[PDB]
Amino acid sequence: QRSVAVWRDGAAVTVPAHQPVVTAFDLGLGRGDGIFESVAVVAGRTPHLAAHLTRLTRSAALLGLPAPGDQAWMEMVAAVLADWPAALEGVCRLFLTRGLGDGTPPTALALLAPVPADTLRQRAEGISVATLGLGVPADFRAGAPWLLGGAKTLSYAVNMAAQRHAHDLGADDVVFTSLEGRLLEGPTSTVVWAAGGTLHTPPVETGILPGTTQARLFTAAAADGWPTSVTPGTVDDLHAADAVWLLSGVRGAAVVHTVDGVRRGDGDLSRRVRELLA
Amino acid sequence: QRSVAVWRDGAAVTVPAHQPVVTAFDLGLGRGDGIFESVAVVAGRTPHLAAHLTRLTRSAALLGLPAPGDQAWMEMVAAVLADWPAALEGVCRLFLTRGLGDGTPPTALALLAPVPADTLRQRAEGISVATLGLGVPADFRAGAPWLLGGAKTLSYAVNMAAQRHAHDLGADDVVFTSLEGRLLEGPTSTVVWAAGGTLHTPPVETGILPGTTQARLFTAAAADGWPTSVTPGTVDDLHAADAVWLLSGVRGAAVVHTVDGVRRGDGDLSRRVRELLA
Numbered sequence: 327q328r329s330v331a332v333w334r335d336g337a338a339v340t341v342p343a344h345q346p347v348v349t350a351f352d353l354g355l356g357r358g359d360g361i362f363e364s365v366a367v368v369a370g371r372t373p374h375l376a377a378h379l380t381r382l383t384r385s386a387a388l389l390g391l392p393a394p395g396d397q398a399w400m401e402m403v404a405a406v407l408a409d410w411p412a413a414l415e416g417v418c419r420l421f422l423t424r425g426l427g428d429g430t431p432p433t434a435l436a437l438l439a440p441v442p443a444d445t446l447r448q449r450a451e452g453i454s455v456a457t458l459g460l461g462v463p464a465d466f467r468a469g470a471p472w473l474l475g476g477a478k479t480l481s482y483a484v485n486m487a488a489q490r491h492a493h494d495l496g497a498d499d500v501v502f503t504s505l506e507g508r509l510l511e512g513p514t515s516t517v518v519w520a521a522g523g524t525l526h527t528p529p530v531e532t533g534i535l536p537g538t539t540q541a542r543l544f545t546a547a548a549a550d551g552w553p554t555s556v557t558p559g560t561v562d563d564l565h566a567a568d569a570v571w572l573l574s575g576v577r578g579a580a581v582v583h584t585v586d587g588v589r590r591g592d593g594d595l596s597r598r599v600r601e602l603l604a
Numbered sequence: 605q606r607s608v609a610v611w612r613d614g615a616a617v618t619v620p621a622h623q624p625v626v627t628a629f630d631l632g633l634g635r636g637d638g639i640f641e642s643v644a645v646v647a648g649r650t651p652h653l654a655a656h657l658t659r660l661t662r663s664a665a666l667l668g669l670p671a672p673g674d675q676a677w678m679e680m681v682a683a684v685l686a687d688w689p690a691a692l693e694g695v696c697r698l699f700l701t702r703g704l705g706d707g708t709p710p711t712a713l714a715l716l717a718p719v720p721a722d723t724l725r726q727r728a729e730g731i732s733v734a735t736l737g738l739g740v741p742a743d744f745r746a747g748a749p750w751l752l753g754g755a756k757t758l759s760y761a762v763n764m765a766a767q768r769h770a771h772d773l774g775a776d777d778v779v780f781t782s783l784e785g786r787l788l789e790g791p792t793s794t795v796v797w798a799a800g801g802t803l804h805t806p807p808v809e810t811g812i813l814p815g816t817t818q819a820r821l822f823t824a825a826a827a828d829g830w831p832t833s834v835t836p837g838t839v840d841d842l843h844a845a846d847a848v849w850l851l852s853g854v855r856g857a858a859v860v861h862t863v864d865g866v867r868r869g870d871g872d873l874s875r876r877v878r879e880l881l882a
């Protein structure tokens with residue numbers, strides 16, 4: 327079961343999930359010209375909705391998209407949650423597109439579906455990853471705002487193509503690397519690794535997305551006395567680590583048990599990461 | 605006036621242009637996971653449709669998208685052309701999306717609208733361009749098929765953001781450059797320049813789109829005795845040229861009269877380019 331709400335004349339309107347909602351001329355379809363958020367629905371609630379709404383505002387600023395505001399998104403989330411089963415974990419995505427062009431109103435909607443069994447299983451049992459190069463220097467995106475570094479966009483054909491290429495090798499997911507070999511991020515997730523008693527993540531100044539799940543782990547780790555660091559790591563760091571995870575709003579913490587075909591353990595560190603994220 | 609046809613149960617179905625046609629869960633919207641072609645409609649005909657359909661097949665191969673075949677696209681084009689005025693120049697776009705996922709059928713449609721007055725005016729009176737870096741080495745995409753070099757995709761948020769950044773400087777359009785400074789292409793067009801009595805264009809091995817308009821110019825130039833070359837040019841070549849154009853299916857030949865604020869003439873070469881493309 328799926329549910330959709332569209333923002334129409336200053337209100338959220340529920341529409342059947344199978345019914346078309348975007349026209350052929352919507353720039354979100356034709357040019358991938360829009361932004362999104364992926365929000366976890368757990369026990370019929372959105373525990374981290376505000377974190378996603380703040381970043382939605384930031385992505386929309388980067389693309390010069392007029393956003394309808396927090397109250398509008400909360401009305402749309404409420405509309406899709408109305409009849410959602412508490413026992414069924416969901417992914418609520420929020421889309422904002424440029425619409426028919428800058429002048430006509432942007433298209434805003436909410437769409438809710440179950441988290442699939444295979445994503446839940448990756449959370450339970452972990453993932454293999456392939457390292458793929460993005461071809462950009464680590465320092466380049468900071469000086470090239472047209473590359474939309476730091477924006478969560480609808481233009482993810484490359485993100486998905488990287489995952490299909492990894493699937494062809496036998497891997498579940500991807501860690502992107504800069505031209506120099508620096509770790510960037512996953513196509514839809516943030517890389518964290520444990521070494522020397524510290525939790526590490528790559529720096530945002532490389533033009534990656536600031537991940538909300540990573541930020542929440544780091545905040546909890548500080549309160550608990552687990553040191554954290556922003557570290558310009560390489561693939562060598564993932565092999566040498568005590569543990570590696572990909573973090574994201576919906577899948578959550580996926581332990582990385584294989585890097586480019588090199589199997590690795592987690593030093594029994596995943597338990598404390600999961601307790602902190604709970 | 606606009607017209608849309610959707611591919612439904614092995615036939616083209618005309619729908620009103622204002623009516624929604626894609627659901628919230630279409631991967632073409634949510635991930636920009638699809639390909640397109642932009643086809644000129646002139647005097648109620650598509651003079652170069654076959655060129656676009658061959659490349660559509662190539663883009664779909666790069667993204668692993670099952671394509672409905674030439675006959676299907678010609679039925680969809682015919683459907684949108686049915687009541688189109690011969691006196692009104694049009695842009696017919698063809699979209700193929702991954703649909704609800706690899707397993708459910710891809711979404712295919714055709715959408716036709718007038719070429720806007722401002723695009724026609726760029727064809728008539730020419731354009732200013734800004735040079736912007738893509739941050740990738742010229743040779744990188746050839747070894748990184750997940751970057752979808754050479755595919756005409758729906759994931760063009762960066763393409764459009766580059767144009768808005770150029771608009772902010774006072775420029776009409778963009779020429780992308782490799783990390784080394786090599787000319788790549790426009791966000792939606794192919795760069796050609798004249799120097800030493802030769803027509804030049806950048807090589808496709810840099811991961812650019814092979815442009816159909818550029819190819820057709822080069823073929824006609826050979827028949828007419830105007831030498832052509834694939835040349836790994838830089839921005840220096842555009843300043844030093846006798847003439848510069850951006851070429852594309854819909855806008856056609858747009859003479860570049862300004863590069864990064866440096867005004868330039870065309871050596872009265874545009875006339876022969878236009879005669880060859882006619």
Ligand SMILES: *Cc1c(COP(=O)(O)O)cnc(C)c1O
Pocket residue numbers: 364478511512513514515516535536537538539540573574575576
């Ligand atoms: C969404 C996303 C993430 C993960 O961020 P969360 O806020 O933890 O969901 C990381 N990188 C990319 C590229 C993403 O799109």
Ligand SMILES: *Cc1c(COP(=O)(O)O)cnc(C)c1O
Pocket residue numbers: 642756789790791792793794813814815816817818851852853854
């Ligand atoms: C469509 C397009 C072109 C132009 O190709 P034509 O076949 O001449 O329309 C060039 N570069 C990019 C990136 C394009 O999308």
Ligand SMILES: [Cl-]
Pocket residue numbers: 364514
């Ligand atoms: Cl996502």
Ligand SMILES: [Cl-]
Pocket residue numbers: 642792
């Ligand atoms: Cl285009």
